[PDB]
Design a protein that fits this description.
This is part of a larger assembly, with one copy of chain A (108 residues) and three copies of chain B. With 108 residues, chain A is mostly beta strands. Chain A contains one helix and seven strands, in the order βββββαββ. The longest helix of chain A has 9 residues. Chain A starts with a strand and ends with a strand. Chain B is mainly α and 183 residues long. Classes of the chains: A mainly beta (108), B mainly alpha (183). It is classed as membrane protein. Keywords: RyR3, Ryanodine Receptor, calcium channel, ion channel, membrane protein.
Chain lengths: 108, 183, 48, 790
């Protein structure tokens, strides 16, 4: 896959997200140069998305799929699986690799 | 030696000493033969007031060569002036903002060359300035003198007016004498 | 993000050391190898 | 500030119930770690071993940790690796362990804040003995015979003691039997013992001669009077030898003789310590393990009194023996040395100041300054524009009073008032109504030599004044601005009734305060720089655009032969990942008259903050991060630094006329290379991705025309402007935009003291729980980040 996962704090290693499940995750996304561009911990609101519906970018969804319950890990989404030639104008420049410090809070 | 003790524990002897020193200094200021006689005594007897003032340092790197009798006396180092300068903090002691307003009024009146009775009358009329002690802008002075005894007789208008008159007279004459000394 | 000055809320960090200083010099009585340990009683990740 | 992902079993961020073991080895040097008793596959090596190394923990709010340093100051939970010593053995017997902040310019206690100066040094604990060199000291022949007697007497001082400690003479020495073959007469003594005694006596004689003491034989008849001591038969051993030590009880020593004995004892201690150090011994804490661990290799002052006396008794016996024979010693007075003292640099003096926006342009204001540590401090008023790298009051930007020497400073020094002492309070008053400045020491006005109370008068208001203080080495102070006038100590005695109001009167929140920190930083060369000047040269058809740096004031009476650290304003950042042209290039031309041996040319990272009078590429900050496999095999090794430069001396050695040095950088591979006069040098560097490198030249000027940056181009290499500015990325025309300017290092800067600080709490939990450090209340600040400078 296009995402490289580097563990930070381990989870249970047994409970993984499944189809038709909401993954309540607290994340912090920054550019490859160290410039932060998003963080759900600043807003005090965990981000919820459902696997298999293609709500989020591909790299983020794959990384959360590999992650287990209560696990904090670093996901490196390359431009292939995170925007690419066209990024978020004014936030994410084109052809930018993204790094997310993602914690899988809940599987409900 | 005893100014700190007098300030921390106010009494009547210190106030009387201030009044005597202020009266002598006022006579010195008003009179013209008094100053000349004091200067003549100092110059003729070659009294160095600096010994009695700062006698209680660059010597190794100074070779003095000029000396004159006229430079032996100056209004700055006069003992008549210096004694009042040192006793003034004992006369202004425990002055609330209202008393400071009254003192400023009295000094302004003295600036017009008015007698003591006229200034006392003006202070008698403008006796509402004491309420400036209750102002919010000067609420930071309300507890400065908490440590001091702050014990006194019942409030009396005449005594306060007389005290403010003496203080304002001394302060005004001291300022007048010191102004010409400035360059 | 290379022309306009950036702003961000950063946590304040502090350093603490014991009173132990070790050095290496010629003709000195100092011993070279040294060892110590740190026990982590409680860490609260994401406090701010 | 670059993380290297290290491999470990059960990798995870540090959490509760984690034990981190840190091992240091200055021999290699190498720093390694262990987590929960499991090794971490990686280490640091090849770093600078200068300075003193201390354990450290950095943390933000929300942690509790405990240092364990062995012994009674913490119980280790894992066995230290063989040969590694616990940190508690690094303390001296007098020192008591404590936990302290690494850097500190202020200390708060119960709501009272002390402003601190700078500490000169730390607990070195490095003896480095330097005993008196007696190698060139020649023993006069006439003093040898008496010396030959003294050592013989010294021999008695040994033998009798062996009797007094229960030792008995035997063919073979035995600790259990108290036996020793040496228990014989001096004539029958083994050659080794006699050689040792003669060598020791010769060393002592040479030490005495080197001190300047003159030995005079003035009592020829005293030797006849001197007699031995008739020891009873119980002293004599089976061999038939009974010691006869000289009867020296009646001998008395003068105070100068006692001083000589003490100096000889100190010199002997230093010589023995040096011998032990050469033997491989090292200082230890209350342990004399035979693995070259001796707890006595310390300075003489810290030595045990009993240990001192152990050899001082023998030295005094020798001195009394010498005095008995009539050889009187006359040392020379030490006042002939005529010592001196050094001057503390202005970079090591700490300035504290109220913020410029609080400057006052009218009214009568008062503030106090308590001198906790009487010493080198200054206090007064400062104009907006006062600089931190000039002594407070040596120019027209500050009006200060110094109480250590009783002087007043404004555009010079003039004696004024009287000196202070610890616990004094200086009340500073400014009367901006009539341009006057007054000082009081303990409620009493300080007057000039002419009897005037006005420390300063008749000054131009201009912008205004703010309180300023300057603290020297190890100095402490407390600036009280009057946020609560009842905390003043002498406001009422002198200051209240005279019309002066507290400086911070009728203010709701505390007053912002700035301080001066010694963090060297590159700043643009101004048009008024007193030493160097920069001229832009436009790019013609052949000559590329250039920046010519020349020395303003060299060759005159104001010449300053000091190093100059020049950098270019904008960086050249490498790509975030490594595998039309991706190479950048620039050049430097050193004019004739500038010695190439005093010129270093290259690149510097944004984190270069070094300033010194003498530069040397060997003395550079560096480190190598080695990453190993599960079995410890090294599969990577990264070398960091903040200065990739080449020396002109090496180029000239491998190579008047101008010298051109070209620096080229492959951004796609992050490879730095150099070439002098076309030929490619062998000095190449490798840097990591996302690395910003500024062109830099560090040189000691030897001529008015110093050098010039040439922002040219060559085939397959971009110009500097093309690599820096994305606008000109496509354009191949070299340019020198006005944003690209030459900067020089400045050593001191103002810095804002934070409004709030972390509340760290330290405490000794027990003799087996080590030392506790906790920080719980969160704190944050909004930082403004300048992108190019990083």
């Amino acid at each position: 896959a296009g995402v490289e996962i580097e563990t930070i704090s381990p989870g249970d290693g047994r409970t993984f997200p499944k189809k038709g499940q909401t993954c309540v995750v607290h994340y912090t996304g920054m550019l490859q140069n160290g410039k932060k561009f998003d963080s759900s911990r600043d807003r005090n609101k965990p981000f919820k998305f459902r696997i298999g519906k293609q709500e989020v970018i591909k790299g983020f969804e794959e990384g959360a799929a590999q992650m287990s319950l209560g696990q904090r890990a670093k996901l490196t989404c390359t431009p292939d699986v995170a925007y690419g030639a066209t990024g978020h104008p004014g936030v994410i420049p084109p052809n930018a690799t993204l790094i997310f410090d993602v914690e899988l809070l809940n599987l409900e | 030696n005893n100014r700190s003790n007098w300030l921390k524990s106010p009494s009547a002897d210190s106030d009387q000493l201030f009044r005597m020193v202020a009266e002598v200094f006022i006579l010195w200021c008003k009179s013209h033969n008094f100053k000349r006689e004091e200067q003549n005594f100092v110059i003729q007897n070659e009294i160095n007031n600096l010994a009695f003032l700062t006698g209680d340092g660059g010597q190794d790197q100074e070779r003095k060569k000029t000396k004159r009798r006229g430079d032996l006396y100056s209004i700055q180092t006069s003992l008549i002036v210096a004694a009042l300068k040192k006793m003034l903090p004992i006369g202004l002691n425990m002055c609330t903002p209202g008393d400071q307003e009254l003192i400023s009024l009295a000094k302004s009146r003295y600036s017009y060359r008015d007698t003591d009775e006229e200034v006392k009358e003006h202070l008698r009329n403008n006796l509402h300035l004491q309420e400036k002690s209750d102002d919010p802008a000067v609420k930071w002075q309300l507890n400065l003198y908490k440590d001091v005894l702050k014990s006194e007789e019942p409030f009396n208008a005449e005594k306060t007016i007389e005290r403010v008159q003496r203080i304002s007279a001394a302060v005004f004459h001291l300022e007048q004498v010191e102004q010409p000394l400035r360059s | 993000r290379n022309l306009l000055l950036q702003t961000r809320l950063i946590n304040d960090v502090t350093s603490i050391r014991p009173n132990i200083f070790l050095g290496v010099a010629e003709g000195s009585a100092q011993y070279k190898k040294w060892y110590f340990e740190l026990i982590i009683d409680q860490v609260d990740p994401f406090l701010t | 500030r670059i993380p290297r992902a290290v491999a470990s079993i059960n990798l995870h961020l540090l959490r509760s119930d984690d034990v981190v073991s840190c091992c240091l080895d200055l021999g290699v040097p190498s720093i390694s770690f262990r987590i929960n008793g499991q090794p971490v596959q990686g280490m640091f090596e090849n770093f600078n071993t200068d300075g003193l190394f201390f354990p450290v923990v950095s943390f933000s709010a929300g942690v509790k940790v405990r240092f364990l340093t062995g012994g009674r100051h913490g119980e280790f939970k894992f066995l230290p690796p063989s040969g590694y010593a616990p940190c508690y053995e690094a303390l001296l017997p007098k020192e008591k362990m404590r936990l302290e902040p690494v850097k500190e310019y202020k200390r708060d206690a119960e709501g009272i804040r002390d402003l601190l100066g700078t500490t000169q040094s730390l607990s070195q604990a490095s003896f480095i003995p330097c005993p008196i060199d007696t190698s060139q000291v020649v023993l006069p022949p006439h003093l040898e015979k008496i010396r030959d007697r003294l050592a013989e007497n010294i021999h008695e001082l040994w033998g009798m003691n062996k009797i007094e400690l229960g030792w008995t003479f035997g063919k073979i020495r035995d600790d259990n039997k108290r036996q020793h073959p040496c228990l014989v007469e001096f004539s029958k003594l083994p050659e080794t013992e006699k050689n040792y005694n003669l060598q020791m006596s010769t060393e002592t004689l040479k030490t005495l001669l080197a001190l300047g003491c003159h030995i005079a034989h003035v009592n020829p008849a005293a030797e006849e009077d001197l007699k031995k001591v008739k020891l009873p038969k119980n002293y004599m051993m089976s061999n038939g030898y009974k010691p006869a030590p000289l009867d020296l009880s009646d001998v008395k020593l003068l105070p100068p003789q006692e001083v000589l004995v003490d100096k000889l004892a100190e010199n002997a201690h230093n010589v023995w310590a040096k011998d032990r150090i050469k033997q491989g011994w090292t200082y230890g804490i209350q342990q004399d393990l035979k693995n070259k661990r001796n707890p006595r290799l310390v300075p003489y002052a810290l030595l045990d009194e009993r240990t001192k006396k152990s050899n001082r008794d023998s030295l005094r016996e020798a001195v009394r023996t010498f005095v008995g024979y009539g050889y009187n010693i006359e040392p020379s007075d030490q006042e002939l040395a005529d010592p001196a003292v050094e001057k503390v640099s202005i970079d090591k003096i700490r300035f504290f100041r109220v913020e410029w926006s609080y400057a006052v342009r009218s009214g009568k204001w008062y503030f106090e300054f308590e001198v906790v540590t009487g010493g080198d401090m200054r206090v007064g008023w400062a104009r907006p524009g006062c600089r931190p790298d000039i002594e407070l009051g040596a120019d027209d930007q500050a009006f200060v009073f110094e109480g250590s020497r009783g002087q007043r400073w404004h555009q010079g020094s003039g004696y004024f008032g009287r000196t202070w002492q610890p616990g004094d309070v200086v009340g500073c008053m400014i009367n901006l109504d009539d341009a006057s400045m007054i000082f009081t020491l303990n409620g009493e006005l300080l007057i000039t030599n002419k009897g005037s109370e006005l420390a300063f008068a008749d000054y131009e208001i201009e912008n205004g004044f703010v309180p300023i203080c300057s603290l020297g080495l190890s100095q402490i102070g407390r600036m009280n601005l009057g946020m609560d006038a009842s905390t003043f100590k002498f406001y009422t005695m002198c200051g209240l009734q005279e019309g002066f109001e507290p400086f911070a009167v009728n203010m709701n929140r505390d007053v912002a305060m700035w301080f001066s920190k010694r963090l060297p930083t590159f700043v643009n060369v101004p048009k008024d720089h007193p030493h160097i000047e920069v001229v832009r040269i436009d790019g013609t058809m052949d000559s590329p655009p250039c920046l010519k740096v020349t020395h303003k004031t060299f060759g005159t009476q104001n010449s300053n032969a000091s190093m100059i650290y020049c950098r270019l304003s904008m960086p050249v950042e490498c790509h975030s990942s490594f595998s039309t042209t991706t190479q950048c290039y620039y050049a430097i031309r050193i004019f004739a008259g500038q010695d190439p041996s005093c010129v270093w040319v290259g690149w510097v990272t944004p984190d270069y903050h070094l300033y010194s009078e003498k530069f040397d590429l060997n003395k550079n900050c560096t480190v190598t991060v080695t990453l190993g496999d599960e079995r410890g095999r090294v599969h990577e090794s990264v070398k960091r630094s903040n200065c990739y430069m080449v020396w002109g001396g090496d180029i000239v050695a491998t190579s008047n006329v101008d010298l051109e040095i070209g620096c080229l950088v492959d951004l796609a591979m992050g490879m730095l290379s150099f070439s002098a006069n076309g030929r490619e040098l062998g000095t190449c560097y490798q840097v990591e991705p996302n690395t910003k490198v500024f062109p830099a030249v560090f040189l000691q000027p030897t001529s008015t025309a110093l050098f010039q940056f040439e922002l040219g181009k060559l085939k397959n290499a971009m110009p500097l402007s093309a690599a820096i500015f994305k606008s000109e990325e496509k354009n191949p025309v070299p340019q020198c935009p006005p944003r690209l300017d030459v900067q020089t290092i400045q050593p001191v800067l103002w810095s804002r003291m934070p409004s709030s600080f972390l509340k760290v709490e330290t405490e000794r939990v027990s003799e087996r729980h080590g030392w506790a450090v906790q920080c719980l209340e969160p704190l944050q600040m909004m930082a403004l980040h300048i992108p190019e400078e990083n």
